[PDB]
Design a protein around this ligand. Sequence first.
Ligand SMILES: [Zn+2]
Length: 140
Amino acid sequence: SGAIYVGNYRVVNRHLATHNDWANLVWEDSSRDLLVSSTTAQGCDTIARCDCQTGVYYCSSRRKHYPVSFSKPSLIFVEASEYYPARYQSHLMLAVGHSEPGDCGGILRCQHGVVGIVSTGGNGLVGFADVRDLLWLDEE
Ligand SMILES: [Zn+2]
């Protein structure tokens, strides 16, 4: 589980979105596994605006933050998980590391702020849904 709280936005994995998220929907995209809902209270997370490929992510299944190198956001075939079939996911970045379904929502951060959230796992890779291209999270 986990979310990004930036301004009056809550960013979560689409597959973990709640009724309340859908009842306050701003934007969603199945192909990215992202959903953004509106919040009453202001969040304080800063979104990275950068092309970093190194950062640190939280892995709830190990109670650990791991430093990782990660790929460029791209369209990648993802093997079936407990929450999605085998399919193409867009704006996805991969690193070598541990990811189980419960790790979805873990933050990846670089020196500039939040890069993305854990979205995929398996075969010793962890996949992060990038948010750095969503410049509107910074405003309104
Ligand atoms: Zn960065």
